[PDB]
Structure formats: structure tokens, C-alpha cells
Design a protein around this ligand. Structure first.
Ligand SMILES: Nc1ncnc2c1ncn2[C@@H]1O[C@H](COP(=O)(O)OP(=O)(O)OP(=O)(O)O)[C@@H](O)[C@H]1O
Ligand SMILES: Nc1ncnc2c1ncn2[C@@H]1O[C@H](COP(=O)(O)OP(=O)(O)OP(=O)(O)O)[C@@H](O)[C@H]1O
Ligand SMILES: Nc1ncnc2c1ncn2[C@@H]1O[C@H](COP(=O)(O)OP(=O)(O)OP(=O)(O)O)[C@@H](O)[C@H]1O
Ligand SMILES: Nc1ncnc2c1ncn2[C@@H]1O[C@H](COP(=O)(O)OP(=O)(O)OP(=O)(O)O)[C@@H](O)[C@H]1O
Ligand SMILES: Nc1ncnc2c1ncn2[C@@H]1O[C@H](COP(=O)(O)OP(=O)(O)OP(=O)(O)O)[C@@H](O)[C@H]1O
Lengths: 362, 362, 362, 362, 362
DNA sequence: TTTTTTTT
């Protein structure tokens, strides 16, 4: 009649929960009967209803515990340990293979019985995106492969172009795809130390909107970024490890993650420019805005923001062999759903609408 | 029956594992039945497959205990305590001898060749590197003398040159073939005095670029570097037994570690001297880029970053007595393994190709 | 049947260890069966081999204990507490005996089984050092008892002299013998707050040359320092206690320490002169520098700044009566070495060599 | 058999010791056999020898304790509470009675059989100080009573005079007679805030060398202090509580304590002048200087600075009843002691001799 | 047997003590037998002699506890909890009624059998304050109502007049009567952030000496405060909640307290003029000056600053029904005491002769 | 004890 710390640790592992407060909160819900658990009846949250009946009996005794935070602490530690072990041992290809498996599990329930998504809407987003730039999907693949190999001195891509020209809109989807974080280099010289400290164990980073000093004749305000990146040239090249730091915790040391920069059409040092591998200079395209005006439901649902939209685009455009073996099994299934669910001229109609600037559906 | 904290502390000692999170993660892998273990079968990481057979019985009991992080702390303490003893009592030679042996062991896998690389790559590595500097081999040797003799005045070497000159990559490689840490000091020091616990218990530290107080008036970005160096002219001259402030990181009293100062072509007030072996020049020189461009495996496999790519240079030339008195058979074996495998006139291919600025493998 | 904490504390006292990782690491070395202990076989370190045989059985139980760092923390407190009892109750004369043991114990290493450096170079120092000043050894013993009696007003000697006159050099050797700190007063006034705050709690100090507004008559850089200096009478004469301070931190309130002033030959008021016991007018002088510029191995060993070479000089020159009575029984053992090893012609030759301006070793 | 924490608490109380480390160290000394205790034999510190025999039995078992520091921590907590109770509840006259009982204890040592200094030599100082200002002893009793009553506005005394007028000497002795702190207000308006925080919970403050304005018309260097004081009228007046601040801490509210001001002959605004209850000028006096020249032991033993000297003077001159009733019993025996140890003729002979400017003794 | 932690929790709740060392220190006093406790026999401190016999045995056991500070922390946190509860739940009228009860209790000691003050001197005090303004009691009654309603906009009062006019005297008395804190907005704009953190949870605040600018046309120094107050509009109007900040604590939110602004007769922006309900002008009145000269016990005993005198003014003047419902019983009884102690004739005679500036008492 | 506040 005592806490199975083991059963608690199973749940924290299986959910990948890594906040002690969230773990505590979630586990407590299992104290009441699953038998009439209205959340289970709603099938509302899988992280709840998948587990409640199994964990109920343990959670009933957990509710009486006087140690509760300590039990959750050791549970969370086990989840963090797995993250650390993986970060040292796995190849980046395998890390990314796992990241696909996570998102593909999420795409189960979104389209399952709960199913609250509409697959039509999400593919309108792909059609809008794929219309954005020539040969769109191939560019995503090239970024991902570069990110996988992590070729030293060849780690960063330049996105350039006017305000609202969609570079952030693209980038947000890429970041959700890989997992990673965003940071700002418009800050006072190398005073950014604890913000660059964010990048510990991250797979990818993205920097927003370098305020290129001197562009303001063209209404482009100046700022720190250009020369902060003139400074961080080792972080650009990645040819060395560095320290990074966070509070009431040890330092940590690693290669710095590869990433993306976004900027307006400020000038740039040709040398700093030569530290980037590649550019994408975005331009406004009115018909996409007119399309959006008539297609509000996308943004209400953040569809074009979402890495889930990119994944559907690759499942659409790419051969099955283009991805790691085990997920090819899943990718095959995700061909099947598209094959079944769309007539090809459905996508034609949709992308045809996008180009005509009508609402994507009609 | 009981968890044996002893058996855990053995594993920490033997792996030389040195973070509670890494250690905790590792040991929990053993809790599955060894006889079946897929990682043992797969032979993926020796830090597991060498040990799972032995520790499995104990890990079963470890997995149940309600205080797991405490065991890992005591075990990590033992590994760090071992390092702190040797941090005092060793001759400078035996420290460097320790550092070397592990590279030989890694080379045993690499070139006893259950590990992967083609030594031809790293011979080509030595070609690219050894071409960089007049008498580079002696430069490495002369550094090691200055290090192993801990020499006052001579305690620092000043790398002056443009960026992309390699000076930092060189310094970092000596942070491989020697232990040590990098450092930055270009700020008003008041609360920053707490940082150099990083330099406590170091044989060596490298001061990164002097972001000067004259600064961008030199076309080189500003900071507090030059004046801070001028101020701490006591410490650079080794005048002080280290009582710099901590940031949790605990105490080995020492003279401040020797090493390098680096400078992207900034100004210097002549007062800063009486305090080095010398200043040292560096330049980018296109043909070396021409070769690298034609040889970028040197960069992909990070050959040029490595201090492995300096160790191998030593083997190929020096009398074994210039190395440790004791280790001498190990180097003789590796000498033979490559003295057999090339004449100098073979990999003189690489030398003259690098000298010509042209690709360094066939 | 259990760890005796008592024996750990004895060892912690007898080592005078006061860092927890050091004590922990070392005491675990006693684990192995003492009879074969290879550190004992080699006689590596007495702090081991004088103890393992005694402590052995207890160290077995220690290694099996489940709270090791808690034992070590209490033992370290016992050692550091002893210092603070002594920090209260001891006279400056008894406190001076620390220096002598500190110096002699280090010197045992310096001429250890390693003969860590050839003691003959240290004696070649002792020779050259005595060459530098009229009645050099008496000039030291003058300063010694000057600093013992700490006599108010009668507290300070002015090291006057031109650039590169060895004043700082002798101060450095004196500061080696004695310890100290160095400070600057040419600073703007706001600095002195914390700058002088640095002087807090030290047995002796020096001031860097007072760059002073009139010296640039010579172009002696005309910092604020001399006008700044003649405000500070209460500190110098040590008549009355004074406040000191630290960044981010409180005042401290104490009698101001004694010590040394360097300067190059600015003008001064007799107002300032009266603060001093004494003045010394260094200059660079012929066969002293011109011997060293041959015998620069002593620059490389910095014996030219070695307070422990002053200690050998004292042991050579001075009556047994000149030293605190108990510790005379060590000094005799060093006298006996010097008598044999520097049989008189050895010493006489070395000094004579310097007196020929020619390499002190021949 | 258990440690008695109570005996440790009593020792911490009786020694009035409030550093956990100092307390710990001293209590350990008692574990060794009392009989042969060389500290006891040398009568080295009463804090030891007047206690070792009492505590020895408990100290031995305390030396076996596993938890030693917590015992000492609780003991220190006892003493700090006792201070804080007293600080909030005693009358000012009781606080001064405490200071006097304390000094009388130390004088029992100085002139006891241990005889650590000559009562002759200290009485030489009393004569010299009684000669420093007219009616010296009467002025001292006034000042003490003024601080004891602390009547609002009637709280501050002015010590104005040239350099080497001795005003610092008098202030030091008074501050030693009462306990208190010096302050500097030649700071700018920034630093004052933490400077005044020094005064927290003191009995006296002394303001040092307030540099006025325009003084170089009389060669006096000018500065902030006078103008700063005249803002602080409400701190001087002492009629309402003020907010006081320490670094890293919240503000505190209390009445600013009474005190003393020193300066050269600057002009004083009538506003500031009016807030002083007495002005006491000082003058240089040649016969004091020529007398003091020969009575060298006065400076070299710091007699004329010491509050022990002031306490002696009050005993020699004042009526018994003028003392608080508790110490009056001790005053009798000290008067009677001194009245044995000197005639009036002896004492008046010193005063006469000092007026002649000649070495004090014959 | 055991320590009753609950009896300590009573004693803290009883005494309202909320400092662990004051609580600790007092609780320890009781361990000696109250029967001979001289603090009891003296009845010197009510917080002792009321309680000693009651807590005797528990203190005797508490004196042997090994957990002493743990007991006290729990007790102290109980008292903090009560304040926190009341800080939310009470009305402003209850807070004022609570505050009045505290003062009445101290008055009953002061004028009790212990009688440590003379009610006639305190009544003499009341007369002088009545003469400071027209209709003084009506003014006080207006002020308190304005505070208790705390009506937005209508929250602040301005005191104005030349220096030595009584404004600070009245402010300090009103501040004692309600409780509150004083603040100095004349700082520069940065630390003013932390300055306002003092206002947290206060019933009331006072702004000192808000320095104008260009006041030197009126012989006044310029400053900063007024410009800062215009940057603080809504803090005064009390319409909206504000953020507040102490050192080393995360911010909190509340309506900023009502209060009083004080200045010498600078000019005011009409933007600032709009904040205030009312302003009161103070004129220097020499006959008060002459009265204080001849009535010194007023100042010396700090009568005229103390809120007790304002409460006496309220009791002697105001009709009973104006007081909060519960205390009307006590107030009636105190009026009855005052009518016993004085005829109106006597009070009228005091108020008369003050008007001619002769000393009060006759 | 850091981290924040102090420092700047
Ligand atoms: N190329 C485009 N043409 C027209 N409208 C666009 C384009 N790209 C994005 N939009 C619209 O502008 C909005 C903002 O786009 P986005 O933030 O990606 O632009 P941005 O140039 O990267 O801007 P910023 O630098 O401010 O982040 C989008 O949500 C979409 O509504
Ligand atoms: N001789 C060369 N000519 C041109 N490019 C070179 C040469 N040597 C190295 N490089 C390039 O410069 C890149 C950066 O080198 P590295 O950072 O070591 O230079 P550095 O001078 O030490 O720079 P910094 O001091 O600014 O960090 C290398 O990865 C390589 O691609
Ligand atoms: N008489 C001498 N014989 C040998 N070396 C000398 C002599 N005088 C000076 N030197 C050398 O001059 C160099 C500088 O000496 P040091 O720092 O003590 O001089 P300083 O006068 O204090 O310096 P500064 O020029 O800064 O005032 C040292 O190498 C010292 O050994
Ligand atoms: N009245 C005096 N007449 C002559 N010499 C004096 C007198 N008072 C002090 N001295 C000499 O001046 C020295 C300094 O004394 P002290 O610091 O007390 O003087 P001060 O005038 O108060 O100083 P400050 O200038 O620091 O205010 C004494 O040690 C003594 O040598
Ligand atoms: N009406 C008055 N007429 C003359 N003197 C007065 C008057 N009121 C107060 N005083 C005198 O002024 C002294 C100081 O009073 P108080 O501090 O309240 O003045 P203030 O003008 O408010 O000062 P500040 O503006 O400097 O804070 C009192 O102790 C008293 O001696």
C-alpha cells in the first residue's frame, strides 16, 4: 500500500513531461475514477485518457502522500536524463527521425475520431506556401539536409526582403518542424549572453529581423545585429565548441546549433554575407494577400505558421525513399490518406484559387 | 537487500563520467536484462556494452530506490575528488601524459581501425596545419616546454592577426592536445570577478579577442579589453595566488593559469609586456584557403579543429624522449604503424600540394 | 564497526587540508590494502605514505559509508576554524613564523627529491641578490623588524629611483618573502574608494609609482597621484584605525597596514616626505644587470624576484640569534646544507663572478 | 553519553562570542587534558584559561559529536537574540554602564599581575591629555552626559582647528570610550546614501574633515561636505526618525545618533553653525610637541589615542557619585589603587614638566 | 515531556512579535523563576512582567530543546500570516480603529500607575499644537476622514511654508497616528524605482521636501522631485493599480496609499496642483518660538511630534459619536479621566498663555 | 549564495 515511484516514472517518461508542476497536475487527475472520468468520456486529451485507467490505482495512494514534490522530482529527473543521454549519443539523422515520429503521432489524433482538424484546410496552406516561391518543397529539403549534416562553416541561411514579406511566416513553420528556439540579436553588443544561453541542447535556432545599421533613409531603422554577427563569427562557423550558461545551474559546453537569420533589405558585409551558405530574398505578392483576405480561417487556425503544414507538403511532393527507413512505413500510410482523400484536381482547384486571389476554397 | 553505492562509484570512476544527469541516465539503461540487451548486441556505445553484463544485478536494485540522485552525487563527488587530487600532486609532465594517453586510446579504435577514419585524411590534416606556420612543429613543442615548465614571464603568448587567420583555431587545438579553457574579459569587471572559477584548476587558459577600449576607432569593435589587461597586469605576470571570486564553482588555489592572449589586430599599450614569451603574427593567405576549399574534409571531419591533428605531427618527427619517460612503447607502436605506412616522401605529396595550395588527398 | 569521524578529523588537521574535495579524494586513496600501496612503495607523497598505514582500516569503512561529504565537511570546518582562532590570538611576530615555514616547506619542494630546480641556481640568486645593495642582508633585517614593530609614523620606506632601477624587483622579492598587495593613486578620486578598499586585511603592501602632476617636467607622467597622496596622513602613520570598503559590500574598520612606496623622481613636499621613515634611491648599476644579461637562466627561474632566495640569503648571512627561537632548529639544518653544498669557495666564486660582471655560474 | 548543548550555550554567552567558526574552534581546545594545558600554564587568554577546566568533560564528548556545527549555530543564535533584546530595551545610560564594565575588565588585565603595561606609562598619557585642552576632564564629563541624554537639537559638537591640532586624537579616544563610527561626507550626493547607512544602530557618529568651500583663500582644499551637512538638518536635529540604507538591503527607520564634526578653519554658514551645541577649537602648541618628542612611548604604544586613557582620567578627577551606581563599587577600588600608586606631587610634577616641553619622566 | 509550540505561538500572537531573534531573546528570559525575576519585580517591561509566570515551565523545557530556532520560525510565521489575512480582509475603518486601540493601550501605561509620563505635560503639548493652525482639531478630523474613505483624486494634501514652520512636525505626528512611511522623491530617476517599494502595504505615505526648480529667484535650491511627481500622476489620484518593487523580490501590485506632500514655497505646475484635495499654509509664529524656549520639556521629551498628542487632541475635543463604534466605550472613559484631571479653565489658561509666548506651565 | 543589487 505504497507509492510506486516506478509507475509514476513510467508516466513521466511516456508523456515526456519535463515540468514538475505539469507532471504533478496531470498525475493528480487520475485520483478520481476513470470509470466516470468525464475527460475520458469526452476523449478530450490523450495524455489523460490513454493513461487514467492504468494509473488510477497508483494515483489514489499518491493523493495521500506527504512527499509529493520529491516523487515528481525524481520522475522528472529520469526524463531529463534520457534527453541528455540522447543528446550525446544519437546522430542528428536519428534525432530528426524521432522528431518526425513525434509530429506524426500528433497527426494521429488531430485527424482521428476527435479528428478536430480539417485536412482540406491544411492542404490549402500547403498550396499557398508552395505557390510562395519557385520549387518550394525542394528548398525545405535542402535546408533539412544541411541541418542534418551540420556542415561546418556552412551552417546558416539568409532570409531577406520587405516587411510582411513572409519570411517569419515561413520560418515559424520550419522551427516547429525541427524543434529549436528563436532569439534576438538587436541587443547591446555581447550583452546577449543569457539569451544565447537558451541554445543548450537545441537542434536549431532562428534569429529575427536584424536591424541593419544605416538603412533608415529607406525607413529601415538601425541596430545591433549586423556587428553582433560580425562578432559571433565562431558561432556562425561552428568550428569550435563554446560555453553557455543558465542560473543556479552549472555551465554547459557544446558546438553551437545551426540556424536561420531574417532581415529587411539593409546592406550587409560581403564577408559576413559569405558566412551564410544561402539566401532567400522574399517579396510581397498581392494576390496572396487578397487570397488571405478571403481565407481568414487559415490564420485563425495558425495553419501557415505550423510545421505540420510543411510536413504535409513533403509527404505530398517527395518520394518515399527520401526519409529514414522506419518512418517510411508511416510515410507510406500518409501517402495513402492523401491518395484516398484528394482527387488531384482538388489540389488544382485549391492552388488555382490561390493564384487567382479568390478565397482558397470556393 | 541493498543498493551498493560502491558499485555505482566504480562505474563513475571507470567511465570518468562527470555529470549526475549523464551518469543517472547511463546507469538506468542497465536495468533491462543484460542477456537480451539490444545495445549490447548492437555494440553501439562501449560506455554501455562493456558494463551492462556486470552492473545489471545492481541496477535492478538501483532502479527501485527513492533517492537516486543522491547516489549519483556521491559518485560524481568521487570522480571529481580524484581529479582534484591529481590537479595538485601530479608533475606537469604526468598531466600532459594523461591527456595524451586518451588520444592514443581513441586512435587505437580509429586506427586499430574498429573505428572509422582514414589516417590519410589526418596526415593530410598535418599537411594543412604544418604548412601554416614556420617551424609549426617546434611552435607546438616550444609551447609545451613553456607549459610543462610553467614559466614565469613566459606564461603568455600573444596571437596578433586578422580574423580567418586560424589563430583561435590553433589555440583551440591546444585546448585539445592540452586541457584548458577559453576566457573573455572585455567588460567592466565589478560583478564579473565571480567568473574565473572557470580558470581555477586549470593548467592553461586562452584569452579570446581583446575587444579594445580604443575599439572601433581601430576599425575593430570596442570593449574594455585593453584597459582590463593593463589593469590586471599583476595577474598576467602571474604575481597573484588565485583569490578571484567564485560562482558556486569551488577552490583550487593556484597561480593564475598560463596560456595565450589573442588579438584581431587591435592596438596595445607597451606597458602590457614583461609578461609573455612573445607576440605572434597570423595572416589569412589565400592559397591555404585554396587547398582547404579543395580538401574540405579537413573541415567536415574537423581535422583542422582537432589537437589530434597536432599529436600525429609529433609522432612523425620527434625523439621519443621529448615525450614522457614512461609511455614510450605506445608512441613507438604508433610511430611504427605510420612510419611503415608512409615514407615522408609519400605524404610529401600532401606537403607540396598544400604548399601549392592544391588538394591534399589521393 | 563504523567510520570513526575522529580519525578523519585528525588527518584533516595534520594535512591542514581545508577543501572538501581534496580531503575526500585523498582519504579514499587509503582504501587499498596498505601493505602493497604503490604510492608508499615509491614514496610519492608523505601526506599519503605517512598515513595510509595508520588510517587503512578506517578508510575501508569510509569508502562503504553513504554520506561521505558530510564527514569531510565537518573535518574541513575543524581546520578552517583553527585558522580563525589563530587569526584572532596571534601576535605579528608569531604570524611572521607562518611565512618562514611556508617558505621553507616550499623550498623543500624546490630542492626536493626532484631537486625541482638546481639549488645552486638559487644560491647563485642569493649571491646576485646580495650583490645588489650595500649591506643588503642588513637592509633586509632592517625592514624585517621595521615591519614587526609597526611603529606609528615610523612605518614607510620610499623606494625612489629611475625607470628600471630594480625597486619593484626587490619589492617583488620582498613581497614574495612577506606577501602583500599593490595599488595605484594616480587614479581619479572616485577610484580610491574601492582601490584603497583592496588593501583590506593584508600583512604588507606596496604602492605603484605615483604618476604625479609635476613630473612631466621630466615627462614623468603627470597623473593626479601626488596631489592625491598628500591627504592620507591617517592611513600612513597608522596612529588611528580607518574604514575600508568593497564593491557591492560593506565597510571594514581597522588599523591601516604598513609597507612600501615605489616612485620615479617626481617632486614632493616635505609634508609628504615627513610621513616616511626613510628613503632609498635605486638606480640600475653596471655588473649587476650585466651579469644577469649573461646569466638569464635566473631571469627564467625569476630567482631575481625570489623571496625564498632572500630566505636562503638570510640563512647564509645572519646569526642564529636573528630568528624566532624554536624555528632555529630548522634553520640549522639549512645552514648545514649551505655550509657543505656551498663550501665557502662555491659561494665566494659565485659572488665573485657577479663581481666580474660575468655569469654567476662557471 | 550526550553532549550538553546548554554548556556550549553558556560559554558562547559568557565569552559573548557570536561567530560560529570562532566559537567552534575555541570550544574544541578544551578537549585536551586540562592539567597540562600550556595555554592555561601561560595564562595566555582568559577566554581559554578561565574556562578550560570548567568545560573539559563536556568538550571531550563534543569532540565526538557528528553534528558539531549545528550545536555552535544554535549557541550563536542565543547571543544574537540577547543583543537584539538589549538593543531594543536598555536605557542609554545602561548601555554606557555596559561599555564601562567592559573596559574595567580589560584594565584589570593591563595593570593586573600580568602587568601587560605600566600604569605609570598610561598615567603619563592622562597628564598629557589633561594638558591638551583647558578643563579637559570637565569637558569629557559634559560630552558623555550629552550623549547619554541625547536631547534633540542639543546633540552635536564642533571640533574646528588647523592640521596637527590633535582633534583627530581626541575624537578617536572618545569613539573608543563610547563605540561608534566615523563617516566621510566629502562624497557627492550619490554615495551619501550608503555612507549614512554606516550610522545604523550606532551610539555615536564622527564626521571627519568636512571640506568646505573657498578655503584655498586660506589654503584649505574645498569640497562638498559643508553644503551636504546643511541639507541634513533633520538628521542633526534628531527630532524624528529617518530612513537609513545598506547595500542589498531594505531601508530601516530610526533616529540618527549624536556625534562630532572635525574640520579646518572653513567659514561656517550661520544655519549650520546654529545646529551645534558646543564649538571646541584646537590649537598647535609647541611645548606639547617638544614634550611629546621625548615621550616617544606615548605614540609608539598609542596611549594618547586610547579610550583606556580617557577612562583613567575620569577616575582620577571625577567624584564617585558622578558614575552610575552599579560601577561605583569598581570605581572605589580603582581610585584607591591609583591613590596608592601615585601621590598628587607625582602627578602634578608630570603636568608641570609637560608645560616645560621636556621628556615626561624623572 | 515536550515543548508546547502552541504556547510560544500564543506569546508571539500576544506580543505581536514578528522578529525571530527578538522573539527568541525575550522567550529565553522567562527560564529563570519569575518569583525572583528582577525584571518582574521592577515591572520594567510589560512584554515581560505580564507573561513571565505564565510561560515559566514551557520556557524551562524550551531552554533544553535542540530545535529552538525551528520553534520560533513557525511561531513568527503565524504572526505574519495574521497580518497578511488582515491586509486583505479588513476595512480601512477597522484598520484605523485597530491602530487607535494600540495607542490607547500605550497611553494607559504612560499615564498609568507606572506613570512614566505626566499627563499635564502631554496636555501642555496639546495646547501648543492646537495653536499651530486655525481650527486644528477640525483639520485633523478632516484629514482622517479623507484617508479612511480613500476617495480617488481626492486623496492628497499639500503642506506649504518656509523652513521652521512645523510642517515636518505635523507630518511626523500624523504619520505616527495612522502609521505609514516617508519617501524621498528628490533622488534621480533610476533608484526611485526601489524607493517606492517602501510604500508596499502601508496605510499612508509622506513625501518630504519635494524640491522645486528655479526656486533661487526665491532664494531656494533647485532639485528634481517636482518633475518626478508629474511623472507619477496616477500614483496620487489612486484610480488605478500600480506595480511596486523591493530589493531581491519580484514585483507586486496594489493601489498606492494616500498621503501628504510637503515643500517650502516653490512654484507648482498646475498639472501637479490638480492632485490635491486641499493645501495648508504654515506661517512661522515667533510666540511659539518663545514658548518652546521656555517650555523645553515639550521638545526634550519629543511631545509635539508624537501621535499620542493628536489622539489626546481628538479625545479632548471631538464628540464621541465620531469615533468607531467599539472604542466609544474606551473614549468615553478617557474623556472622563481627562475631565477629572483638568478643568477646562486650566486647559484654557494653558492655551491662553501660549498665545503670548510665555512658557506653558503656571 | 547567487542573483540581484550595486555598480556605472
Ligand atoms: N510575400 C507576402 N506577400 C504578401 N503578404 C505576405 C507575404 N508574406 C506574408 N504576408 C502576410 O504578412 C503577414 C506577416 O508576414 P511575415 O511576418 O512572415 O513577414 P516578414 O517580412 O517576415 O515580417 P517581420 O520582419 O515583421 O517578421 C503574414 O502573416 C501574411 O498575412
Ligand atoms: N590562410 C587562410 N586563408 C584564408 N582563409 C583561411 C586561412 N586559414 C584559415 N582560413 C579560414 O578561416 C576560418 C576561420 O579561422 P579562425 O577562426 O581560426 O581564424 P582566426 O584568425 O583565429 O579568427 P578569430 O581570431 O577572429 O576567431 C577557417 O575555418 C578557415 O576556413
Ligand atoms: N642594478 C641592476 N642590476 C640588474 N638588473 C637591474 C638593476 N636595476 C634594475 N634592473 C632590472 O630592471 C628591470 C626592471 O626592474 P624594476 O621593475 O624593479 O624597476 P623599477 O625602477 O621599479 O621600474 P619602473 O621603470 O616601472 O619604475 C628588472 O629586470 C631588474 O632586474
Ligand atoms: N595640540 C597639538 N599641538 C601640537 N602638536 C599636536 C597637537 N595635537 C596633535 N599634535 C601632533 O599632530 C599629530 C597628529 O594629531 P591629530 O591627528 O590628532 O591632529 P589633527 O589636527 O586632529 O589632525 P587632522 O588634520 O587629521 O584633523 C599628533 O600625533 C602630534 O604629533
Ligand atoms: N509655527 C512655528 N513658528 C516658529 N517656529 C516653529 C513653528 N513650528 C515649529 N517651529 C520650530 O521649528 C522647529 C522645526 O520644526 P519642523 O521640523 O516641523 O519644521 P519645518 O518647517 O516643517 O521643517 P523642514 O521643512 O526643514 O522639514 C521646531 O522644533 C520648532 O522649534
Amino acid at each position: 500500500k505504497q507509492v510506486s515511484w516506478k509507475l509514476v516514472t513510467e508516466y513521466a517518461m511516456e508523456t515526456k513531461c519535463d515540468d514538475v508542476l505539469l507532471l504533478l497536475g496531470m498525475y493528480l487527475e487520475f485520483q478520481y475514477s476513470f470509470e466516470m472520468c468525464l475527460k475520458c468520456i469526452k476523449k478530450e486529451q490523450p495524455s489523460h485518457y490513454k493513461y487514467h485507467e492504468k494509473h488510477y490505482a497508483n494515483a489514489a495512494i499518491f493523493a495521500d502522500s506527504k512527499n509529493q514534490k520529491t516523487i515528481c522530482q525524481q520522475a522528472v529527473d529520469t526524463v531529463l536524463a534520457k534527453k541528455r543521454v540522447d543528446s550525446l549519443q544519437l546522430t542528428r539523422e536519428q534525432m530528426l527521425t524521432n522528431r518526425f515520429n513525434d509530429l506524426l503521432d500528433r497527426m494521429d489524433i488531430m485527424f482521428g475520431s476527435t479528428g478536430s482538424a480539417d485536412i482540406e484546410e491544411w492542404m490549402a496552406g500547403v498550396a499557398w506556401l508552395h505557390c510562395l516561391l519557385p520549387k518550394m518543397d525542394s528548398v525545405v529539403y535542402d535546408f533539412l539536409k544541411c541541418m542534418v549534416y551540420n556542415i561546418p562553416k556552412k551552417r546558416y541561411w539568409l532570409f531577406k526582403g520587405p516587411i510582411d514579406s513572409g519570411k517569419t511566416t515561413l520560418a515559424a513553420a520550419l522551427l516547429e518542424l525541427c524543434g529549436g528556439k528563436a532569439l534576438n540579436v538587436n541587443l547591446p553588443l555581447d550583452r546577449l549572453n543569457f539569451e544565447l544561453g537558451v541554445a543548450i541542447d537545441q537542434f536549431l535556432v532562428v534569429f529575427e529581423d536584424v536591424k541593419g545599421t544605416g538603412g533608415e533613409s529607406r525607413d529601415l531603422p538601425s541596430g545591433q545585429g549586423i556587428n553582433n554577427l560580425d562578432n559571433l563569427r565562431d558561432y556562425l562557423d561552428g568550428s569550435v565548441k563554446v560555453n553557455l550558461e543558465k542560473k543556479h545551474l552549472n555551465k554547459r559546453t557544446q558546438i553551437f546549433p545551426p540556424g536561420i537569420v531574417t532581415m529587411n533589405e539593409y546592406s550587409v558585409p560581403k564577408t559576413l554575407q559569405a558566412r551564410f551558405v544561402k539566401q532567400i530574398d522574399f517579396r510581397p505578392k498581392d494576390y496572396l494577400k487578397h487570397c488571405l483576405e478571403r481565407s481568414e480561417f487559415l490564420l485563425e487556425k495558425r495553419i501557415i505558421q505550423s510545421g505540420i503544414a510543411l510536413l504535409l507538403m513533403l509527404i505530398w511532393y517527395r518520394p518515399v525513399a527520401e526519409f529514414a527507413q522506419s518512418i517510411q512505413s508511416r510515410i507510406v500510410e500518409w501517402k495513402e490518406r492523401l491518395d484516398k482523400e484528394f482527387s488531384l484536381s482538388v489540389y488544382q482547384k485549391m492552388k488555382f484559387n490561390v493564384a487567382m486571389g479568390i478565397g482558397v476554397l470556393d
